[PDB]
Amino acid sequence: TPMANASTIERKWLVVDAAGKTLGRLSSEVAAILRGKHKPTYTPHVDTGDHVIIINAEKIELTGKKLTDKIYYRHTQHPGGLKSRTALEMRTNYPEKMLELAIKGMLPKGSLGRQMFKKLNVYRGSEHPHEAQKPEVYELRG
Template sequence: MNNTNVQKCSNKQKWYLIDAKNQTLGRMSTYVAKLLIGKYEITYTPHINSQIYIIIINAKDIIITGEKKYNKKYIKHSGKPGSLKIENFANLNKRIPTKIIEYSIKGMLPKSKLGRKLFKQISVYKNEQHPHSAQKPQTITTNL
């Protein structure tokens, strides 16, 4: 008879550090989303959390190509009349540079309970300082 092997959730956490300085937003976001989902792991299973935690530093130095710096819009609405807020990339990057990377990665994750759990495993910081040095993250130095 054929037996099916079912992967179980491992409790071993892996921590990665990614420097966003001079990285293209879309290319870095797709790499981070795939890494977070576990696509680069040998034991990839779509419905299991791979226990990968990612720290992204230097979010203020992210770059985007073309005229998107002025044309890309970030829209939020509270649901109340007259509360629509529209902001372009340049203004949001000055104000809250971490939100740009978070929005980009969140859009690439699955829209389910697992996707919401995976999103909590990302930490984005606008400078080089981060409080996760005790976890000894592995630095990823790829040009994306």
């Protein structure tokens, strides 16, 4: 007989900044926070997460040759319809899909996936419109 919290959750607003880190390990512990797996009242089905705002996403880094290698493949449905985009292409043209697509794979799939995915947003530069909620500052474990 455990406690299954359902919509009685004090949600939260954390901000994780993107100064110079690797977007795998910067999406790593954000994705646990997007479901709130750090929170002690974790039910696995009623979205116990909290909202995450990322600032300065275009200034995020990659070791190795991944600035040129990791081609981001999207596909149409029309025949022969792949559209290749490299990393530096995603980096400078528009990077507001460059951390979203690195977390869309990392949030679990289903109807609850997109429901948790609405809690995410990413702003290029130092916009942070969001002056009405008192957002907090979070620092990752590494």
